[PDB]
Design an enzyme around this catalytic site. Structure first.
Site, PDB file in Angstrom:
ATOM      1  N   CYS B  47      10.537  35.881  11.686  1.00 19.50           N
ATOM      2  CA  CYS B  47      11.848  35.380  12.074  1.00 19.50           C
ATOM      3  C   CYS B  47      12.966  36.401  11.955  1.00 19.50           C
ATOM      4  O   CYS B  47      14.114  36.054  11.665  1.00 19.50           O
ATOM      5  CB  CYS B  47      12.185  34.127  11.269  1.00 19.50           C
ATOM      6  SG  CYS B  47      11.004  32.784  11.533  1.00 19.50           S
ATOM      7  N   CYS B  66       8.365  37.389   0.986  1.00 14.07           N
ATOM      8  CA  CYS B  66       9.293  38.511   0.866  1.00 14.07           C
ATOM      9  C   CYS B  66      10.014  38.607  -0.474  1.00 14.07           C
ATOM     10  O   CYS B  66       9.955  37.684  -1.291  1.00 14.07           O
ATOM     11  CB  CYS B  66      10.333  38.416   1.977  1.00 14.07           C
ATOM     12  SG  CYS B  66      11.296  36.901   1.858  1.00 14.07           S
TER      13      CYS B  66
HETATM   14  S1  SF4 Z   1       9.310  33.703   2.470  1.00 10.41           S
HETATM   15 FE1  SF4 Z   1      10.428  35.451   3.427  1.00 10.41          FE
HETATM   16  S2  SF4 Z   1       8.827  36.507   4.708  1.00 10.41           S
HETATM   17 FE2  SF4 Z   1       8.041  34.401   4.272  1.00 10.41          FE
HETATM   18  S3  SF4 Z   1       8.760  33.151   6.051  1.00 10.41           S
HETATM   19 FE3  SF4 Z   1      10.358  32.986   4.395  1.00 10.41          FE
HETATM   20  S4  SF4 Z   1      11.958  34.554   4.888  1.00 10.41           S
HETATM   21 FE4  SF4 Z   1      10.030  35.086   6.054  1.00 10.41          FE
END
Ligand code: SF4
Lengths: 73, 107
Positions: B47, B66
């Site tokens: 995204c 992330c």
């Molecule tokens: S946790 Fe981070 S890397 Fe995973 S979908 Fe959500 S924003 Fe994207």
């Protein structure tokens, strides 16, 4: 900002990966550490980390910040 | 795709976070993560717009989960949402069918 600079967390930053507060919300505000890295690129290739300032604290703990959340000490 | 599905469900339970009330949103992100892991080898967040997807992967900041999510429980994608979030449903699981429907309709 320079790698090696000492900084104090001035903004309120709630994290969940601190070694003594695992999975538990812990505010780093007031803590002081040393800048270990400023994420901008990998091998010359520009990266987009939105929390580029990597700060290392005691207790084998590190966390990422925005330039505006910390203050040079 | 199936591994990405299982990953999201387990991580969501591990962090006490929930999927979007509208599972189609969840589906799109999971499908996108699955896609990125194939082309790049890592679950790079789908995204976002990157200048060097390959470099991003090597740095790992945006490889799901992330840094913002692992440290601050912040997921701008709306894949993993905190209980108080308005868009947070009470589900921590998503039928495989739902994903299949996304593979069916892409464009
Ligand atoms: S946790 Fe981070 S890397 Fe995973 S979908 Fe959500 S924003 Fe994207």
């Amino acid at each position: 900002m320079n790698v090696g600079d000492r900084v104090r967390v001035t903004s309120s930053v709630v994290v969940y990966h601190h070694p003594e507060h695992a999975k538990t919300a812990f505010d780093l505000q007031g803590m002081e550490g040393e800048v270990a890295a400023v994420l901008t690129g990998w091998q010359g290739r520009p990266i987009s980390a939105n929390l580029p300032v990597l700060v290392k604290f005691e207790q084998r703990f590190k966390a990422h910040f925005r330039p505006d959340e910390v203050t040079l000490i | 795709l199936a591994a990405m599905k299982n990953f999201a469900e387990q991580y969501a339970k591990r962090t006490d976070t929930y999927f979007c009330s509208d599972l189609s949103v969840t589906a799109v992100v999971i499908e996108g993560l699955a896609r990125h892991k194939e082309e790049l080898g890592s679950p790079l967040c789908p995204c976002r717009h990157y200048a060097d997807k390959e470099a991003e992967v090597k740095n790992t900041f945006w490889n799901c989960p992330c840094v913002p999510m692992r440290e601050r429980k912040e997921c701008h994608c709306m894949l993993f949402l905190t209980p108080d979030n308005d868009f947070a449903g009470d589900a921590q699981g998503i039928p495989m069918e739902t994903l299949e429907e996304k593979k069916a309709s892409m464009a």
